[PDB]
């Protein structure tokens, strides 16, 4: 069971890796405590197919507070994914970075947030605006030190009305607290 | 045909209002 799943996830075949990821997602959704296998799925993270990357990101987000120590092995992957040409991959990475409830992980994520703040893609801009609000809610002092208030203020005065609305919502949420 | 009233073509604009 668990050993077979770990062996399947530690294989070199993508056809078995996708099935293992789907089974792990179903077990977590079915109500199975799969947080013990978080380090095993860490190796099978950098994959070309976006179908397994989303599942891995969701598992990490759902298994971030449970194993914060084992989550230290994902900063490099997030940094690498924060520069992919595809806007969808960058948006997913930005969303997953802000969803990680790790006190030792948000400190190193300031650079990707600053890089994605001025992204040309409106989806990337919206993802960065959401991640800024998430980080400010998680750590207001880190957000203030990073100087994201000035970037957020200039977001409303730019193009991309969806991105402007997202920035306004993030600023309202930050000012609410 | 179709239940609920047969479909009818619509105009383009108020021709009598210029």
């Amino acid at each position: 069971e668990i050993f077979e799943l770990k062996a399947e996830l530690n294989s070199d075949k993508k056809e078995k890796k996708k099935e293992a990821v789907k089974k792990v997602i179903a077990s977590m959704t079915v109500g199975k405590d799969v947080s013990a296998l978080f380090p095993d799925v860490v190796n099978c993270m950098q994959t070309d197919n976006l179908e397994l990357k989303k599942l891995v990101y969701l598992y990490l987000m759902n298994y971030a507070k449970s194993q914060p120590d084992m989550a230290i092995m994902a900063v490099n992957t997030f940094v690498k994914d924060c520069e992919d040409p595809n806007p969808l991959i960058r948006a997913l990475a930005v969303r997953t970075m802000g969803c990680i409830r790790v006190d030792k992980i948000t400190e190193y994520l300031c650079e990707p947030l600053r890089k994605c703040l001025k992204d040309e893609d409106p989806y990337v801009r919206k993802t960065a605006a959401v991640c800024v609000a998430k980080l400010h809610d998680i750590n207001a002092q880190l957000v203030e030190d990073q100087g994201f208030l000035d970037t957020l203020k200039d977001l409303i005065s730019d193009s991309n009305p969806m991105v402007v609305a997202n920035a306004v919502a993030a600023l309202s949420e930050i000012a609410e607290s | 045909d179709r239940k609920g009233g047969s479909y009818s073509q619509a105009a383009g604009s108020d021709s009598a209002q210029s």
């Binding site: 969806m162 | 239940k3 009818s8 604009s13 108020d14």
Partner: protein, 415 residues
Amino acid sequence: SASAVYVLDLKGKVLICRNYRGDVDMSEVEHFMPILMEKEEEGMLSPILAHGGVRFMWIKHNNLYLVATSKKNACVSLVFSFLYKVVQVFSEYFKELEEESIRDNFVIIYELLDELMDFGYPQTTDSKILQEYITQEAPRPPATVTNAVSWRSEGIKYRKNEVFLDVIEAVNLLVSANGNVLRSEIVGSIKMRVFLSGMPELRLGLNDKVLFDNTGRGKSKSVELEDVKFHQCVRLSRFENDRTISFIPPDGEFELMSYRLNTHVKPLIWIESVIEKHSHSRIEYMVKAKSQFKRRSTANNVEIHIPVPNDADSPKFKTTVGSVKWVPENSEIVWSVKSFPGGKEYLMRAHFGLPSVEAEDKEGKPPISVKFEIPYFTTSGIQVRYLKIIEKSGYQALPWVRYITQNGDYQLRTQ
């Protein structure tokens, strides 16, 4: 400001959960079922629950209740709108709303939940637009979401340019037991299935009372809609300036405009019902239905629901026209009529048995509901005048529209 969007089941099991803010522990969902049971059992059950400092506001779907936990003073209206958008997206993607698809469409469901809302703030809600980025069977996101026009994908091409409209009428009448109508509201519904090539900018034109008065033609038949609600494609500024309805129709069927005004005309159907219920011996149903609608119109599938006794058994029906059936599941006389010519008069004489032993508790007086649906009938008198289909490429459109009249909240209070 939802903290976690979760989907439960009829047994209290959470089919799927999607945390948005993470400020609420995932173990609070366990107390939602007992809290709902206590509220329902004491009459305090409400769609917005409260587990201490965390509020569980959600609505009941076809098979599961989409309860979304929240902790701060978030907008309950925003949460309800997000839940409605999610339900609409699921209906567009999944033809059925049951547990069979939750456990079978999790791969696409998780992706849709992640993409729809981030940090409790939704960003995309168009099923047609979202279908180009999340599929269950991924390229860059379409420019429609980034562009202002988020309800009309560019580059759509079709062999023909045919748009079918639907002027659906909802006749809602609240007739009191004294025989007078209290609430008589008719809500218009203009639903169009736009199927054209490109991104045409529809310019809908009708014989509106306000428009006729502004143009100076306030003397002909004009519909005086108390409330006119345009869709997302309809530009609010254009309608506010000079009643100009200019918008880009979407690709498929969608609700463009929904008129809503009170009606001061006589009911299209007059129902004269009598109840000669003897004391535990017998009962009589002298129901007479008179069609006050125009004779040229026929009410297809007339269904006048007559609430019969709950414990009535061995009934005999003496009617004139139409099929009358008593459904034990519903406990009422279904006055089913296939075609009802305008001005028709149907008389019925009910006769059913009753047990000698009286009922332990009262059951109330359910109202009599008519399910008449007469197409090609416009009671409000509103007629479509024009529909300006303009395209940059240039094409000859063939718009179509149909008028269907049905019974909405046409319930008649019993005596």
